[PDB]
């Protein structure tokens, strides 16, 4: 199996193209903040929206989320998402999924078809959203770094994070309780 | 709470101080390795021993297993393990977990102390065994390319991980599946 070949293969995948960066941040550093962002929302969606999400289900997805990105490498959103290459990504995208799991037992083979052919649509929205969070969160660094070239994609990040604030009152509560000083200057709890 | 920037500040913490690395690697890309590793190796022992873990509580421990070094820092082993310090640093990380929960929610502030003291002695002998393989992976990477310093821990790495693998089958299965062509020269996933 190539599995765990491309667990560690991740770190040679880079984000955000074509912005100049003081830290290069990876597709594995990436995956482990959504994960971590993709638990805490969904333990505040729990309490306000009564329910109870299938966290395996969900952290597994998170986990393997951008996966697919060792054969297509990391396209950035104004790219990915224009309409020229948008459904033409979406296909290129499903077709990776279908050529990935090789000379794996069978219940490796299932749980890992089971998360890249999910159709569970709330823990789709709930990475989806993490995903965004973790973007603002990058912007917020590299600005807080004095990165001037990121002042405009903290401020589309922003804007469409607000947006999502209005409809979705688990994203509220968590810019409440940590966006809204972020990063911190002070980093108390070292000492 | 500090929790989220905690979560960032983990890409500050260096692992393997002391030696030279062709890539260096932070707490935050080892704990998404350990991740995978702890849910591949859960499926194996599932499969081998005919039981079902909690994968909710395993993933989220194996995520937050080396928070508390975004306090201590990352001690490595030959350091850590010593007769000196062996207890003394069990004792100081176990007074950095006592001191991280601030301003969060209930749900929050029990999931992440149930996560913090943890006493699931199982998911806690899987994420050992699952960090292990990934010092063992790292190894293996850097003597694939070329760093000679890395021979003699990659020997003692593997010596202690054979002898586990005599004791644990689902470790054993795991070394047949993935680390005996590990990593993959010719990355055929990619074309
Ligand atoms: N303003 C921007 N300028 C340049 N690159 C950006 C910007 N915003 C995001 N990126 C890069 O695209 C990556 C992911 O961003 P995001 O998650 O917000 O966009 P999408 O959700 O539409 O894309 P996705 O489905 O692949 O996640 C991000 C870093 O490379
Ligand atoms: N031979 C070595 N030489 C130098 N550093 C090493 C070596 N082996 C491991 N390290 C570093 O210690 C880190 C973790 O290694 P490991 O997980 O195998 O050791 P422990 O399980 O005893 O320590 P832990 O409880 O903190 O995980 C690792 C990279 O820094
Ligand atoms: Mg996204
Ligand atoms: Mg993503
Ligand atoms: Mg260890
Ligand atoms: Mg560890």
Redesign the pocket.
């Known amino acids: 199996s190539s599995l765990l070949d491309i667990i560690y293969q991740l770190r040679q995948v880079p984000?955000?193209?074509?912005?100049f960066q003081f830290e290069k941040?990876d597709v594995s550093q990436?995956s482990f903040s959504v994960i971590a962002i993709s638990h805490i929302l969904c333990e505040l969606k729990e309490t306000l929206e009564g329910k109870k999400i299938n966290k395996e289900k969900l952290l597994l997805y998170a986990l393997y989320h951008?996966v697919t990105e060792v054969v297509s490498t990391?396209?950035?959103?104004?790219v990915?998402?224009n309409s020229i290459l948008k459904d033409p990504f979406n296909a290129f995208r499903e077709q990776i999924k279908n050529s990935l799991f090789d000379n794996l037992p069978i219940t490796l083979s299932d749980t890992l078809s089971t998360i890249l052919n999910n159709n569970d649509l709330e823990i789709q929205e709930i990475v989806?959203h993490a995903?965004?969070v973790?973007?603002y969160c990058?912007?917020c660094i590299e600005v807080h770094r004095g990165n001037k070239d990121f002042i405009?994609?903290q401020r589309?990040?922003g804007d469409?994070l607000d947006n999502l604030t209005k409809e979705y009152p688990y994203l509220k509560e968590f810019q409440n309780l940590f966006l809204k000083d972020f990063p911190l200057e002070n980093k108390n709890y070292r000492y």
Chains 1, 2 share one sequence.
């Open positions: 984000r955000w193209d074509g912005s941040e990436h951008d990391h396209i950035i959103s104004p990915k998402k989806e995903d965004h973790d973007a990058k912007s405009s994609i589309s990040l469409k």
